[PDB]
Amino acid sequence: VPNVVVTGLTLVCSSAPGPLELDLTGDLESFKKQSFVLKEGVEYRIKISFRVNREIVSGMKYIQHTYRKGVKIDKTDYMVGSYGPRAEEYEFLTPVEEAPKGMLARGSYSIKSRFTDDDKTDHLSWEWNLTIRRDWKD
Incomplete structure (x- = not known):
C-alpha cells in the first residue's frame, strides 16, 4: 500500500x-x-x-x-509542497489557464501527467485528453 495514493x-x-x-x-x-x-x-x-x-x-x-x-508542445512543472501523513485527503490546484481558441487550435490534445517528489518517486503517471471545441455540445 503506497505511502502516497493519488485518487483523482x-x-x-x-x-x-x-x-x-x-x-x-x-x-x-x-x-x-x-x-x-x-x-x-x-x-x-x-x-x-x-x-x-x-x-x-x-x-x-x-x-x-x-x-x-x-508531438510535445508544452512542458509545465508545478512545485506543490511538503505533506505529512494523515487520514484526510489532500488537494492542490494548478494556476488558472485558458483553453486555446481558433480554428487552428481546436481539436484534441493529450496530456501526460506525473506526480513525483524529491526522491523521484513515481507516485502516479497517467495520460488523458482534452478536446477543444467552439461549444460544449454544439
Whole structure:
C-alpha cells in the first residue's frame, strides 16, 4: 500500500455543463481513448487529490507535458509542497489557464501527467485528453 495514493483529477471550470473527473484509482489505460470537451477560451484549473498514509513526503512536484498529434508542445512543472501523513485527503490546484481558441487550435490534445517528489518517486503517471471545441455540445 503506497505511502502516497493519488485518487483523482478534476478539471475545474465554472462554465462547464457537468463535472469533468478522472478516477485515478481506476483503469488508467481507458483514459487514453477518452477526452474532456472544453469550450475554446475558457478559464480552468486542474485539481489533483491524494492521500499520504505513513511518512512525510517532501518536494512534491506535479508535471504536465501536452502534445498535439503526438508531438510535445508544452512542458509545465508545478512545485506543490511538503505533506505529512494523515487520514484526510489532500488537494492542490494548478494556476488558472485558458483553453486555446481558433480554428487552428481546436481539436484534441493529450496530456501526460506525473506526480513525483524529491526522491523521484513515481507516485502516479497517467495520460488523458482534452478536446477543444467552439461549444460544449454544439
